[PDB]
Amino acid sequence: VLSPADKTNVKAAWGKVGAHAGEYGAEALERMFLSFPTTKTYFPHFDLSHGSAQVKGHGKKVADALTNAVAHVDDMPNALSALSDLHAHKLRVDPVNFKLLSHCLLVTLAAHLPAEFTPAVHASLDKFLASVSTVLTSKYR
Template sequence: MASGREKNSGPWSQGSFRLEAEPAETRRAPPVRPAAHRAAPRQPIRAAWPGVAPATEDKRAALCRSRTLLVLIQTQKESTMVLSSDDKANIKAAWSKVGGHGAEYGAEALERMFHSFPTTKTYFPHFDLSHGSAQIKVHGKKVAEALTNASNHLDDLYSALSDLSDLHAHKLRVDPVNFKLLGHCLLVTLARNYPGDFSPAMQASLDKFLSLVTSALASKHL
């Protein structure tokens, strides 16, 4: 008569459902896909904002598209704003004071934008972004010239800025949210340099003007 140990030995011992291991010589290795058909692993990228977990390229692209769409929807609404005669007078008065300081203030606004919104630096990879940089001064002059042109065509901003909109949408491929960020920094720059003239009415008029400029520059992104 077999002992208790012998009776309970085997593949289903102790009442547990345990299959015996397959002999090594009969095992088949899983098929190995050719290297050409293997999908490359997605590499996580650094988050665009502090405190946000890293995302994949697809997630970041989707986030950028969503953010751009929201900005475009908002700028479409802003494009329906109308400058009153008082607004136009305030804008003309502000720009007459700027005069020959346009390049200086444009450069200051760019520096403020780079410090306050560091992600905007990605559009200037070959620039010297240090304080007083000659490259920032040159670009600040371009910003000032564009705004001077806009202030001289308040009744036809879209036509006046059409070429710039084409350039930023199709060649430079700038996210239109950056126009709003620069507009905000320009407003702060003007307020700092002309505190006595920056009344609530002046601020409202300039804010409306810069919002319309943003809408005009973003129009070719639609």
């Protein structure tokens, strides 16, 4: 479960991300395509080159989903409901890829949060992103 210290650390962290959420989303996506080339198999229609507006626009949407979830941390399965269907019933990305995106979101937050990304906050953000990953794959079968 996400603890009250987790929710606090997550809100403080994401609160510090501010208007850069969208930007960190695309960066997280680039990191993932470079570090873990298999994830590119889900984006055969995208230009995945550095600077790609497709990657940037997709990053904005990912970052925005993570925003709603923070805004609604106490009831994330509701906040994210529309979105787990989309992955469970259409996109059908294998669950293993969510850990890879999560790790790459954490690396992006670490790279932009010199003061905020303490061990305790790192710990809470990893649990938060696993929680989001679990909601997003909860209707898969």
